Amino acid sequence: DRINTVRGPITISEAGFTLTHEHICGSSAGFLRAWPEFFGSRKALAEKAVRGLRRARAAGVRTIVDVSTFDIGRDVSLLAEVSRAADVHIVAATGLWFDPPLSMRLRSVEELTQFFLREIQYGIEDTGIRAGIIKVATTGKATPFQELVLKAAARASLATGVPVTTHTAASQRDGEQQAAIFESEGLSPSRVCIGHSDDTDDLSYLTALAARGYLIGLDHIPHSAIGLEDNASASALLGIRSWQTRALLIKALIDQGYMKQILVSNDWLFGFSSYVTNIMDVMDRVNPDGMAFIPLRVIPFLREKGVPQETLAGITVTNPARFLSPTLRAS
Amino acid sequence: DRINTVRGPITISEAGFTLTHEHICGSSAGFLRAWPEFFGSRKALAEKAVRGLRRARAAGVRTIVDVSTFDIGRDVSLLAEVSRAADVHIVAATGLWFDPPLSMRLRSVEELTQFFLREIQYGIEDTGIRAGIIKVATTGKATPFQELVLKAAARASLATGVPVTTHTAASQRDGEQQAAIFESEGLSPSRVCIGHSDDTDDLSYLTALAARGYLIGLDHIPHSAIGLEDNASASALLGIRSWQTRALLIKALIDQGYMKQILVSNDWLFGFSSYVTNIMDVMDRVNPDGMAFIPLRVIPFLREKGVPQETLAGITVTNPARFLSPTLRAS
Ligand SMILES: OCCc1ccccc1
Ligand SMILES: OCCc1ccccc1
Ligand code: NA
Ligand code: NA
Ligand SMILES: [Zn+2]
Ligand SMILES: [Zn+2]
Ligand SMILES: [Zn+2]
Ligand SMILES: [Zn+2]
């Protein structure tokens, strides 16, 4: 009956319109604290985040799920501060992305399980802020270490009921290998969201996963380097497909009958240090709406394409609530 | 005229007997704060460190140089706490070791330079604790990023006068490439310590570097897996050469006329998460004296081999003082 947020537990109904894959800041463990000037200042980053969150809130966003793990440099204190200042619920994550340091990479599945459990059950660092989701990632075939992470994520999810969400190389069909590893641990597909799914046009891939019970994360909607074909780093990160092309995947899935398994987001951020310098500016020019892109542009676009009101509401409110609600496997 | 420590500046005379390459804890950025239970607890680690530092102090150690960088998970607050409780001076480091995260790895030489300068001139994180040394590393031929780190280290050293110390794959003669890069930036060899040098039996390589003015860090004295051949991980880390064989390299360099260019240490730690679990216990069994190994066993051993009192004092007090004193290149 409750979802853990950076301000404490909230009831399922309080979540409302939720963005399921976002970040306050895309960084590295200890980075923000050791080099805040990279972002101007910690205060500047916080203010930027508050402005963005307030604008998203004005557009109707009630909660965002910040899928920044330890290795994405998640700073829960920052999350709590901006959450309170903007009055937007923020769900924190545990798990590991694809930049774990040696202290993490050398751990066994058992040790990692304990770490994820710590962040979900007791709290992140010494804050008492409990994670409400487990984030994992692969970028093509999983590495040996990544298989361990996925297994630990499954074990933590099974013990706590908190869902798992992933980063994939959709092109490579990462989702299939992820599902395999998760199922090998007995995890229900309904507890899993296969992320960055809109990064591919393979509808066969998406649909087959959906068919198995998985949640499909169409969270890169505004990501596009069109118009910037000349910026190599940006094209590499953002792609050359339009937001409309990506958004159309939502309707496709809906048309195929999987409206209850779709999760939509922007994968936006206010700070981004784990890539080339300046990518943040580039991205903000590409999508000035930031996190508000979904409600301001995507939802209306889908409606114009014939997606009905109730389906739109189901996807943005219902689906996130069911996913986030901690749910233990029936015995 | 002053060396920066975690408790503030000290005069050159206050340094006294100094261990130039040590660590309170060998970890990863953000690791200790995110998973302190890995070390039992933060308190347990601190207590262990205080006991060890107090015993080293009893044996005559007045200062240690904690060469843990951002990526070694340096927690300056921990260092300050233990320094105060044990009453041992601790010099903190900036620089980058061999496990930098993406936020660091994608940076330019200019950016890294500013980061190192920040840590030396203004302070680490928001503490005001300023670094008194710059740490860098290679493990064989430098990677492209490592070359940048080395160049940034040289620039930071040139601007501040603080020395540079390195981690090397000694048996691969990394010191030579390191020296070439440093020199290409115009840094004086006298501001540089080529570390883990006792890991090789190639005296030619060491004397040729000494001949050029570099300091030679014979900081792995107590490291040995003799008696643990059956332990692959420990063997790989510590080697099969005895402490006496490593200590004899100190005598060899003295005999070749380089007593003013030798720095001796143990490369010890109180916690170690960046390797296999349990390596700390293994290490503590190998060398129960820990940091006190140098004054309790090595010094006497050398004396017994004929090294005079004055030479021993010069290596343990004079050399470290000269190296740590911030020294700008003459105009
Ligand atoms: O019950 C059908 C309403 C609904 C539609 C889309 C997503 C979740 C719920
Ligand atoms: O003046 C000679 C004293 C000395 C001995 C060894 C190292 C540094 C100095
Ligand atoms: Na919980
Ligand atoms: Na300084
Ligand atoms: Zn991602
Ligand atoms: Zn993301
Ligand atoms: Zn080292
Ligand atoms: Zn070391």
Curated annotation (Swiss-Prot), chains A, B:
Catalytic function, reaction form: An aryl dialkyl phosphate + H2O = dialkyl phosphate + an aryl alcohol
Source organism of the structure: Brevundimonas diminuta (Pseudomonas diminuta)
Record's protein name: Parathion hydrolase
GO terms under cellular component: plasma membrane
Domain of life: Bacteria
Subcellular location: Cell membrane
InterPro entries (alphabetical): AryldialkylPase_Zn-BS (IPR017947), Metal_Hydrolase (IPR032466), Phosphotriesterase (IPR001559), TAT_signal (IPR006311)
Subunit and interaction comment: Homodimer.
